[PDB]
């Protein structure tokens, strides 16, 4: 059933990700020796504008390893673009720790297989609980400030047809779209690509969504959880 | 996953109705809730159809819903099968549109046709069964594009000027057939679509590079052909070494132009639901791959 | 005056309904959340005319 | 499930020995059929001396993809994939692959190893490319099409010489020009002029339609959009319509953008999670 995959990643990136249920992303890098480097969704939280100050302090405290800091330097080096450099792998549940760690990922399957999301990153457009829900990973670019720091969200919705979801996203994110137009006018020598990117990975039953806390090195984080989850990857689709 | 859907008829099943429904086996019907058991009211578009309100609303309501295939029936029981992405299935042509080998399919609300005498299916009391239209890509894309054109042109014009343009636009000819859009009334959904279209059109107008701006002028000066003559005839009412050439900036600008044009295309292209293998020679049935 | 009335009775701020498509997808909003505790039975809905 | 193909030509020891090494490559066919003549197999039937590369791309868009693994006496066994399963593909592409890549198909641009030639017909396989390289190469080739008319000036010559090459994860290529014999092919011509036409038509149409739509409930998006248009008008200009002509203009704009859908959407067909020093070989999940 499930399509297992296998990756290697150095110890510095692992310690908070080591909880079995996690989500993993692959990042390209211009540096020749680390051609690719593997980053979990939690590590994006240290830079995500949506994450609150306390959770950002915790993330800064945890990921102090030199390799992880170099990874964040590579991430921040990217000029106003991340989806050109980020690629989604899927959900993982197995880990062996060491000087170089081993973990497996599933790119298509539904074989506990809970997927974990940080509480800061989670939003829903609807408070009514639909019986069937899809979940998506979206990246949104802020433009009203001096330079673009990105926003990160993982959201659940009962909408499947893409254009309807883009309509509702436009409705809720009108400020970001106006900010994108403002960026285009205010700095004409610079040309941003999109306001946000939608990517699809989700099939789950809404009655199996949980709220929970997570611990690492006696540091405490608040998270939201999808329990009876199935993973189906998709293409990074750009919207305005 | 709920790989099967059962539906129960509350009304009595006369022999004629059950035979007629038996002829419909392996056709396509939509189901809103995907729940395991469903009543007979939600089977079909009759609960939601309303000629008083927008065809755009019905288009959205149809594109949002889920698709299912038909299976053989028994007393008070009708069985619906949900397709799985990537597998191979048999479907029957619900509409009169011709189907051809090797082109995609889309789902759209029903359209007016020549005789206007549409056949009625399972008219149980005041309720009726009505099927959606499965349409090959060119016709569906053309009709959605022309509906958006209707919305964009008709705005802020008197009925007199609009009257000729709507009779020119509403009629669609496709592979020897003729069709007409039922009720193209402007709706808030169409206004949102038009706002997005205007924003994308202005953005591509702005961020387009100089070479893209001046290309057709230079070539019309250089060459002369029927296509260029038509383009100039269109632009006639509107009608040297570049001082800067920069491959990297040109690459980035064209990437922005592609994201803009990609966005503008999404307003028109309905999501594919079926890709066909070769079709039976009577144009009534085909074997297709299902996509979600 | 709207805010003052919302404060006078123990009622929450108003909340927009779901749109047509979402209303067709989802079967109900259940705005009144389940109470913390109940010794007596189901809260009898008392309507006034 | 299987698909058979039989060669009408003779095959020697060397021919089948060259063929058998493709035991995991990708081969496209016009449409699904049980038993097809070999002339239908491969992309060779479409190539001609005038119709270019973008036509090949757009036609491969609607073409079906198949896998091959067997060599009977004279029949080649094809193997159609199904969305969700896993299959092994052979790296016919000129680039190296990495775990977690998204893979796309392109017509062969610079094709010696694939040369199974018989009866002046040759087997020719499509390229397998990672997604960013595919998108960038289409962007670059399209702008090279734009420069096609100004190719006399030295600056343009240097710019197009720079644009010819691509570098990607230790590999460096030269992408051949879309121009031949100082002229441009009709297919690339129509693609480029359609893109230029849609840009131009948008430029004029935008003012009238932003004004018309803003007559309804105006918003911040509309006003900033109109300001951007005003800035464009200010920098450009240094030195009513007939309703039928109007409707023709909108139809032309949409029909020009509509044919561009062939090339702009770089649909993904494969995702890979395995790699070996055997890099010629890889295991992938089928998509698209």
From Swiss-Prot, chain A:
Identify the InterPro entries for this entry: Herpes_1
The entry's function note states: Structural component of the T=16 icosahedral capsid. The capsid is composed of pentamers and hexamers of major capsid protein/MCP, which are linked together by heterotrimers called triplexes. These triplexes are formed by a single molecule of triplex protein 1/TRX1 and two copies of triplex protein 2/TRX2. Additionally, TRX1 is required for efficient transport of TRX2 to the nucleus, which is the site of capsid assembly.
Q: How does it assemble?
A: Interacts with TRX2, MCP and capsid vertex component 2/CVC2.
Sorted alphabetically, the keyword list is: Capsid protein, Host nucleus, Virion
Query: Per UniProt, what is one GO molecular function of this protein?
Result: DNA binding
Principal cellular location given in the protein's record = virion
Q: Which GO terms describe its biological process?
A: viral capsid assembly
Naming one, the record's GO cellular component terms include:
viral capsid
Keyword Cytoplasm recorded = no
Question: What family, per the record?
Answer: Belongs to the herpesviridae TRX1 protein family.
Short name of one Pfam family: Herpes_VP19C
Q: What is this protein called?
A: Triplex capsid protein 1
Instruction: List localization entries.
Output: Virion; Host nucleus
Swiss-Prot record, chain B:
The superkingdom of the source organism is Viruses
Keywords, A to Z, come to: Capsid protein, Host nucleus, Virion
Q: What Gene Ontology terms describe what this protein does at the molecular function level?
A: structural molecule activity
Q: Provide a GO CC annotation, any one.
A: viral capsid
Subcellular location(s) per record: Virion; Host nucleus
Which InterPro entries does this one have?
Answer: Herpes_capsid_2 (IPR002690)
Q: Would the keyword Phosphoprotein be found if you checked this record's keyword annotation?
A: no
KW Protein biosynthesis (keyword) present: no
Q: Which Pfam families does its entry note?
A: Herpes_V23
Q: How does it assemble?
A: Interacts with TRX1 and major capisd protein/MCP.
Can you tell me which family this protein belongs to? Answer: Belongs to the herpesviridae TRX2 protein family.
Tell me, what does this protein do in biology? Structural component of the T=16 icosahedral capsid. The capsid is composed of pentamers and hexamers of major capsid protein/MCP, which are linked together by heterotrimers called triplexes. These triplexes are formed by a single molecule of triplex protein 1/TRX1 and two copies of triplex protein 2/TRX2. Additionally, TRX1 is required for efficient transport of TRX2 to the nucleus, which is the site of capsid assembly.
User: Protein name, please?
Assistant: Triplex capsid protein 2
Source species:
Human cytomegalovirus (strain AD169)
UniProtKB/Swiss-Prot annotation, chain C:
Signal peptide from the UniProt entry = none
Quote the gene name from the UniProt entry: MCP
* Record protein name field: Major capsid protein
What the protein does comes down to: Self-assembles to form an icosahedral capsid with a T=16 symmetry, about 200 nm in diameter, and consisting of 150 hexons and 12 pentons (total of 162 capsomers). Hexons form the edges and faces of the capsid and are each composed of six MCP molecules. In contrast, one penton is found at each of the 12 vertices. Eleven of the pentons are MCP pentamers, while the last vertex is occupied by the portal complex.
Family per record: Belongs to the herpesviridae major capsid protein family.
The shown chain, on whole-protein numbering, covers: 1127 to 1175 of 1370
The lineage, from the top, is: Viruses, Duplodnaviria, Heunggongvirae, Peploviricota, Herviviricetes
Describe its partners and assembly state: Homomultimer. Makes the hexons and eleven out of twelve pentons. Interacts with triplex proteins 1/TRX1 and 2/TRX2; adjacent capsomers are linked together in groups of three by triplexes, heterotrimeric complexes composed of one molecule of TRX1 and two molecules of TRX2. Interacts with scaffold protein; this interaction allows efficient MCP transport to the host nucleus. Interacts with capsid vertex component 2/CVC2. Interacts with the small capsomere-interacting protein/SCP.
Species this protein is from: Human cytomegalovirus (strain AD169) (HHV-5)
As for subcellular location, the record says: Virion; Host nucleus
């Amino acid at each position: 059933q499930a399509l297992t995959a296998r990756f290697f990643v150095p110890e510095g990136l692992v310690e908070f990700e080591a909880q079995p249920g996690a989500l993993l992303i692959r990042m390209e890098t211009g540096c020749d020796s680390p051609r690719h480097l593997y980053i979990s969704l939690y590590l994006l939280g240290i830079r995500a504008s949506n994450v609150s100050a306390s959770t950002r302090c915790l993330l800064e405290s945890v990921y102090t390893a030199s390799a992880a800091r170099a990874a964040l330097q590579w991430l921040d080096l990217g000029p106003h673009l991340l989806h050109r450099r980020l690629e989604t792998l899927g959900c993982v549940k197995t880990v062996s720790l060491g000087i170089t760690s081993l973990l497996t990922c599933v790119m298509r399957g539904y074989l506990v297989f809970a997927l974990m999301i940080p509480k800061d990153m989670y939003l829903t457009w609807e408070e009514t609980r639909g019986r069937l829900q899809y979940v998506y990973l979206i990246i949104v670019y802020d433009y009203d400030g001096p330079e673009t720091r990105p926003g990160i969200y993982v959201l659940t919705s009962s909408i499947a047809h893409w254009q309807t979801l883009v309509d509702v996203a436009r409705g809720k994110f009108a400020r970001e779209r106006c900010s994108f137009v403002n960026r285009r006018i205010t700095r004409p020598r610079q040309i941003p690509l999109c306001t946000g990117v939608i990517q699809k990975l989700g099939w789950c039953l809404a009655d199996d969504i949980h709220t929970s806390f997570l611990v690492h090195k006696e540091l405490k984080l608040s998270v939201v959880r999808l329990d009876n989850f199935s993973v189906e990857l998709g293409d990074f689709r750009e919207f305005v | 996953m709920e790989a099967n859907i059962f539906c129960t008829f509350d009304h009595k099943l006369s022999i004629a109705d059950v035979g007629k429904l038996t002829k419909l086996v392996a056709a396509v019907v939509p189901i809103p809730q995907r729940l395991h058991l469903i009543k007979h009211y939600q089977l079909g578009l009759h609960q939601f159809v309303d000629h008083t309100r927008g065809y755009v609303r019905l288009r959205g309501l149809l594109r949002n819903m889920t698709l299912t295939l038909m299976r053989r029936v028994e007393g008070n029981q009708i069985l619906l099968h949900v397709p799985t992405h990537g597998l191979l299935y048999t479907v029957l042509n619900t509409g009169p549109v011709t189907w051809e080998k090797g082109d995609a399919l889309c789902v759209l609300p029903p359209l007016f046709h020549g005789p206007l005498a549409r056949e009625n299916l399972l008219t149980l009391g005041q309720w009726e069964l009505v099927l959606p239209w499965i349409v090959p890509m060119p016709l569906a894309l053309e009709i959605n594009q022309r509906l958006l054109i209707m919305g964009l042109f008709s705005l802020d014009r008197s009925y007199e000027e609009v009257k000729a343009a709507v009779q020119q636009l509403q009629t669609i000819t496709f592979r020897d057939a003729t069709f007409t859009i039922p009720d193209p009334v402007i709706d808030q959904h169409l206004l949102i679509d038009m706002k997005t279209a205007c924003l994308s059109m202005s953005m591509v107008a702005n961020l387009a590079s100089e070479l893209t701006m001046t290309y057709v002028r230079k070539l019309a000066l250089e060459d002369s052909s029927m296509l260029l003559v038509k383009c100039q005839e269109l632009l006639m009412r509107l009608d040297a070494r570049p001082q800067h050439v920069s491959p990297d900036d040109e690459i980035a600008r064209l990437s922005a132009l592609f994201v803009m044009l990609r966005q503008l295309d999404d307003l028109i292209r309905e999501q594919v639901v079926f890709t066909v293998c070769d079709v039976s020679p009577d144009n009534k049935s085909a074997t297709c791959i299902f996509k979600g | 005056v709207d805010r003052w009335i919302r404060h006078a009775a123990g009622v929450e701020r108003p909340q927009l309904l779901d749109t047509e498509t979402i209303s067709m997808l989802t079967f109900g909003s259940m705005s009144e959340r389940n109470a913390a505790a109940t010794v007596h039975g189901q809260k009898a809905a008392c309507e006034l005319i």
